[PDB]
Design a protein around this ligand. Structure first.
Ligand SMILES: Nc1nc2c(ncn2[C@@H]2O[C@H](COP(=O)(O)OP(=O)(O)O)[C@@H](O)[C@H]2O)c(=O)[nH]1
Ligand SMILES: [Zn+2]
Length: 278
């Protein structure tokens, strides 16, 4: 009879589902009119199927998704674990804000993780204090070391229950942190993502988030809504883009220091970058 499950991967041209109750990995086939209609199914999709245990099962229906990450297709993602690096990979605030813009656009909770702390000397630490100085009040920050183990237990606290996606520049330590959180687990024909179950309940995606940092589906005038800070600020004009406009609460805030310059700076850069399109 009808049982609820979460899709976790696509094996041998078939959907692999996991039983929401207390189930194992039941392989499946989608039947019905999903054919007639165009109701596509993805990893992370919640579904209800028929347990013909005498050989896997059959997917009867696919629930409605809260969202759908793209390239590595993933549905119903709650969190973005943004792993950042001050030294070694060197992460610019610009890249960081593009990541946040993306996480916000897909309406996801974001947890910023400054990794490789074990490698930082005094100058590096200063750069760290600058990251906290910028993002402290906009997002949760956790200082970690995949090697030392520093900050992992605290990070396990955010992964619990939720379906999470790792994001960050190559080399920043995404796969190493994963293994630090759950020995054995690791980041990545077979072009679809997979959901890895955490020891403590919850899942993390096979491959990394928006690795292609593609901000195009965003209209210029839309971008401003993806910078938390820009909101409680009042600007003269109706829907002021905060760039040239004559009077801007946002521009005012920057001259004050209520808004980090880097934030404004990167937002404007991104703004103009989106304008170049017809
Ligand atoms: N010292 C130190 N090295 C780390 C840390 N995390 C990852 N690394 C190293 O950084 C390299 C890249 O890590 P990896 O997890 O593969 O990066 P990813 O591309 O973000 O998944 C590997 O050679 C690791 O040995 C960390 O917290 N501290
Ligand atoms: Zn404005």
């Amino acid at each position: 009879l009808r049982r609820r499950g979460i899709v976790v991967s696509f094996h041998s041209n078939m959907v692999t589902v996991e039983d929401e109750e207390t189930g194992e990995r039941i392989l499946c086939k989608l039947r019905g009119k999903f054919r007639l209609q165009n109701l596509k199914i993805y990893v992370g999709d919640r579904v209800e199927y028929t347990p013909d245990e005498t050989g896997s099962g059959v997917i009867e229906n696919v629930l409605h998704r809260k969202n759908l990450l793209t390239k590595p297709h993933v549905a119903n993602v709650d969190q973005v674990i943004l792993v950042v690096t001050v030294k070694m990979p060197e992460t610019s605030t610009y890249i960081i804000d593009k990541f946040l813009v993306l996480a916000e656009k897909n309406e996801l909770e974001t947890v910023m993780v400054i990794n490789k702390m074990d490698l930082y000397d005094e100058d590096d630490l200063r750069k760290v204090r600058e990251l906290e100085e910028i993002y402290s009040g906009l997002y949760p920050i956790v200082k970690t070391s995949a090697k030392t183990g520093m900050g992992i237990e605290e990070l396990k606290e955010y992964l619990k229950g939720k379906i999470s996606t790792m994001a960050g520049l190559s080399g920043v330590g995404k796969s190493s942190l994963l293994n630090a959180i759950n020995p054995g687990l690791k980041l990545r024909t077979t072009t679809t993502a997979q959901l890895l179950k955490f020891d403590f309940g919850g899942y993390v995606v096979d491959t990394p988030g928006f690795a292609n940092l593609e901000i195009n589906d965003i209209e210029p005038e839309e971008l401003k809504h993806y910078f938390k800070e820009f909101g409680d600020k009042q600007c003269f004009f109706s829907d002021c883009n905060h760039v040239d406009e004559p009077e801007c609460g946002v521009k005012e805030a920057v001259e004050n220091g209520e808004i980090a310059e880097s934030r404004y700076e990167n937002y404007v850069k991104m703004f103009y970058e989106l304008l170049g399109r017809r």
